[PDB]
Amino acid sequence: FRIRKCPKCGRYTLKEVCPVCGEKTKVAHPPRFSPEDPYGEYRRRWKREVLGI
Amino acid sequence: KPSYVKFEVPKELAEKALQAVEIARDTGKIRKGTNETTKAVERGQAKLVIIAEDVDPEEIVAHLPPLCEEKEIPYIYVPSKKELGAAAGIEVAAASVAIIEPGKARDLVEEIAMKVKELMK
Amino acid sequence: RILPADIKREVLIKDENAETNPDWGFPPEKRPIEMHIQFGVINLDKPPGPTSHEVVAWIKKILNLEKAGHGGTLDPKVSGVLPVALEKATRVVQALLPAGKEYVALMHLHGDVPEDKIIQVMKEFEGEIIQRPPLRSAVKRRLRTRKVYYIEVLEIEGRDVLFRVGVEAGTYIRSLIHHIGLALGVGAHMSELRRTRSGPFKEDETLITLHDLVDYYYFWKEDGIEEYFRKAIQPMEKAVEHLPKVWIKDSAVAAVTHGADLAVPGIAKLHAGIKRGDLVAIMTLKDELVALGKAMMTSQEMLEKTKGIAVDVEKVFMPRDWYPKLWEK
RNA sequence: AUAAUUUGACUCAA
RNA sequence: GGGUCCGCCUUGAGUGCCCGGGUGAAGCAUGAUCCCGGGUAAUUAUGGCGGACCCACA
Ligand SMILES: [Mg+2]
Ligand SMILES: [Mg+2]
Ligand SMILES: [Mg+2]
Ligand SMILES: [Mg+2]
Ligand SMILES: [Mg+2]
Ligand SMILES: [Zn+2]
């Protein structure tokens, strides 16, 4: 994927550094999801630590 | 650094991890790419898991640290997925790699495993 | 750079003395989590891969819902804003499906074109365009007019053109890009597409991926933490933000939920600029969605008159027992 | 059931 | 008689695509290729049929 989005100002760009605010941009599209979600237990273990649960 | 990076890896140790992948690529056995790497871990085949620090979105590799900890498999971080892909012998980036047989990197993987253990605590 | 959903209306006060009783009804804030889901809409960030229809099927299965529907079909390879109305809120999509949309697109040109020429020609596509739905479509393949509200070129890297576009519902961006290529002579195709706006829904803190949606669900289900999943679901009132509103008295609410049309003496407040035949949202003075309807009067007619049917009630969303029966013989 | 709508669907058999 | 609310007015099989498992190689390990399995939404209007409420100028 080529479309990137700045996490700071929300600018859509193809650049790795945002042309508006200079922040490092991220890929605009969400990762693949599966209803089977075989590694959900392990992703949630990471997420709980990040969120503080 | 992304939230899936649980500890700070010194430059020297990260370079040894890439060295171990290159050597195991040539003399042993590796799995490259996150699906291959994940299966190697869950099947209990991985000796060492190498994870890139610039994976976006984080969800591609976020399950790997908790999975490795559950399976008692050491893991290490390297700064660059393109560099990890290159070390694994492919033309594209690799978000993660598993060393199955270290080959001539036997002692190197043992050293890395010792150094990550003290970083974990 | 603005859609019809951005244009704001003035509030006209018909009855200044009209107040609401805090003991009746369930405003979004007072809804228990189970009730919140029943009258909820998810601002989903669709992943590339599955069709929009499959995604809704997945949501139904994982969240254990009997009913759900989306506010407009995004193609398999397309990501972004997909409003998913749930359960008792499912029918609110009728306000979403014909609403204006915004996209961010990547166009690949098949030849070399100067940057000023690209900007110039793409500006010519703003306004009415004539399209026929492609061989792969869910609607009748007849010539039809669609409105392009704005096009903004963000950046150009050689043959790759990144642009934002605001369109009328049912405008085919792949076809639009194809005709831009023809106007530039060299030809073009769409390589990447993301929806950034769908009616009142946009890229804010309420936009949620399937990963976060299901994780927050299990944080509630299995961890017993309601807060994350609550914020994952929007009240059905959100799906109505872009519509003109009539605010009604407590004593008119139960009547409307029991099948009565809305008469003039029941109106407390209303938005200006309502025309006859317009789709309006009937709201309580607590900003609960009661019903959708068609205006039988203009804004000025509703305000000035004392008798007559103001709104023909068509779709009732509020349960009958939220407000007591306050009407007379 | 019939006709439509939504940026994604199509064919065949009772 | 009218209005609102709920349900129904086919089911299979297959193609496509996707997802999981297995495999793990311009583009491509954030997954090429092939095998196996599974999945694939609603809304509106009109009419018909079964049911639930109400007939309300607030
Ligand atoms: Mg697969
Ligand atoms: Mg075959
Ligand atoms: Mg198949
Ligand atoms: Mg009947
Ligand atoms: Mg009965
Ligand atoms: Zn920025």
CA of C181 to C1' of E26 (A): 25
Q: Can you give the residue ranges of every domain in chain C?
A: 1-31+236-329, 32-235
Name C277's Cβ contacts closer than 8 Å, sequence gap at least 6.
Answer: C294, C295
Residue of A nearest to B58 (CA): A31
Which one-letter DSSP state was computed for residue C7?
Answer: -
Q: Can you give the residue ranges of every domain in chain A?
A: 1-53
Alpha helices for chain C (secondary structure H): 33-38, 52-63, 115-123, 173-183, 210-221, 227-232, 250-257, 299-304
Cα Rg for chain B, rounded, in angstroms?
12
C309 shares contact with chain A (CB less than 8 Å): no
Experimental method: X-ray
CB C159 within 8 A of CB C214: no
The CATH label, of 3.10.20.30, 2.20.28.40, 2.40.50.140, 2.40.10.220, for the domain at A1-53 is 2.20.28.40
Distance CA C47, CA C149 (A): 26
Query: Resolution, rounded to a tenth of an Å?
Result: 2.1
Burial class (CB in 10 A: 0-12, 13-18, 19+), C82: buried
- CATH fold of B1-121, please? 60s Ribosomal Protein L30; Chain: A; (3.30.1330)
- Residue B102 phi, psi (nearest 5): -65, -25
Was domain C1-31+236-329 assigned CATH 2.170.150.20? Answer: no
- CATH fold of C32-235, please? Pseudouridine synthase (3.30.2350)
Cis status, amide bond into A38, omega within 30 of 0: no
Q: Can you give the residue ranges of every domain in chain B?
A: 1-121
Kindly determine whether the C-beta of residue C196 is less than 7 Å away from any atom of nucleic acid strand E. no
> How many angstroms away from the CA of B5 is the closest CA of chain A?
10
Both structure tokens of C256: 């409307």
Distance CA C227, CA C224 (A): 9
